[PDB]
Structures are given as structure tokens and as C-alpha cells.
Amino acid sequence: DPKDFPSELLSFLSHAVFSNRTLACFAIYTTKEKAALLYKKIMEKYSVTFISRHNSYNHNILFFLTPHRHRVSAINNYAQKLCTFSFLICKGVNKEYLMYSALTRDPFSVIEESLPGGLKEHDF
């Protein structure tokens, strides 16, 4: 199992998962089956402004923007505990538009998302 996000995405993320800094943009790296489940569950739980699910290195990345702010560890506590089997990396996204954009391009691709083409820069 991966221990972190793919290397080409790291610079877009916050790496202190127990930070007290609240954010609205998060990513989750997990298996494709866990991601497919969580796509729906996270969308409902947090009434997300946007969520997308992507292919990444034989697994999946979820990218989402919530309307209200949360700590990374609160999002993780919800997501990680739904299904604890296998891996799940949950980090805040600092560079929101660049992260999503990279996730739509080789070596990544969009599987499904809640708004075709994603959000614009000013939405973040």
C-alpha cells in the first residue's frame, strides 16, 4: 500500500495531519472500491461544493471542496473509520485548483465528478 500521495502531487498538499488549521479542500488516497463508496458518503456527510474521483497508480484519489471549514483530522476520522481495511491517506489541499487540474491529466484521469470540468480558480 502507498504511504503517501503520489510524488507529483505532494507540493500541493498540507502535510501536518494533526494541524489545528481548518480548511475546506481535502484529498483522500485509497483503493478504488473504498473511494467509490466514500465518493457518495462524503458528498452527503459534508454537502460538498464539489467532489471528484480519479485514477491514480492503480488506486483512486478523491478531491473535494466543502462549503464550511474542518480540521483535516475531523475529515479523516469520518472517512478512515467507515472502512478501516487497507490504506487511506487524508490530507488538506493547499493548492486547490492546481491539484484538481493535475488530477485530470496524465498520469491521472477523472472517473466521476459532481460538476463536469470542475470548479474555476475563484471558487477556491
Contact flags string 70-89 toward a copy of itself, x per CB under 8 A: -----------xxxxx----
Please say which residue, 96 or 113, places its beta carbon nearer to a copy of itself.
Answer: 113
Binding footprint of a copy of itself, residue count (CB under 8 A): 11
For a copy of itself, the binding residue among 22, 40, 69, 74 (CB under 8 A) is: 40
Please say which residue, 25 or 35, places its beta carbon nearer to a copy of itself.
Answer: 35
99: left (phi over 0), alpha (psi -120 to 50) or beta: alpha
Q: Can residue 37 be called a binding residue for a copy of itself (CB under 8 A)? A: yes
Q: Contact, 112 vs 43, CB < 8 A?
A: no
Cβ neighbours for 122, distance < 8 A, ≥ 6 positions apart = none
> How far is the C-alpha of 59 from the C-alpha of 73, rounded, in Å?
22
